[PDB]
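Q: RBC36, please. Structure only.
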Amino acid sequence: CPSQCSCSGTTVDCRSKRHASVPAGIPTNAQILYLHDNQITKLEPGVFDSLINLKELYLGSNQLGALPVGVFDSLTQLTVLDLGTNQLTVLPSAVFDRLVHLKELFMCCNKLTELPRGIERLTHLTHLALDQNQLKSIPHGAFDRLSSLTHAYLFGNPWDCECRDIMYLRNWVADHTSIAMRWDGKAVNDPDSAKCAGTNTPVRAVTEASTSPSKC
Ligand SMILES: C[C@@H]1O[C@@H](O[C@H]2[C@H](O[C@H]3[C@H](O)[C@@H](O)[C@H](O)O[C@@H]3CO)O[C@H](CO)[C@H](O)[C@@H]2O)[C@@H](O)[C@H](O)[C@@H]1O
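A: Structure for RBC36:
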């Protein structure tokens, strides 16, 4: 068992141990790896390659500024991926590609400005968390294939209701009011939680006429 970690069968728990990098010696039979709440500043190319039976991976609350290309390619059985509370800005376009069975994707509280490419194809997603980033909008159709969504976290983004290309997210929240969630120390259903930048007005209440294709 790795230094400053605890191991119980297939669970490897290294949360809250001031790790400055992913620790060597992680058992390859591990199905759950808690690495959240450290100050891991980078992931080494290949760091997870050996862990091909991994099902849940938590990397929340670290110092991740970037993800290496293919860092998650080995984890074809992965169902939970938590990346919330890092310093992420841009992701590699195919970083989620192999995660065809992913059900929970947590990415809150980073510095994202566009929806990361790939999210569109993760059809088994039940949870998707994008709250507290810097997204101005959502590309048209990005949620079409995500027909298993029960929780969507969209609050705390500078949504741009001036632009007509908010109308997808507008329409989408109105059509899925029940999966629209805010966070009150837990999950709370709130179709209004997603709000326009500046005005603090609910995104789903945005009117077709109130927008302009020439103000984006
Ligand atoms: C750190 C936390 O981040 C936001 O809370 C989000 C919440 O984070 C979970 C996190 O996934 C979990 O690994 C950690 O151990 O506990 C957090 C709960 O506090 O996850 C939900 C979605 O599941 C939301 O995205 C939350 O926004 C932030 O809102 C909290 O204040 C807190 O800083």
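A: Brief note, in case it's useful. The two ends are 53 Å apart (CA to CA).
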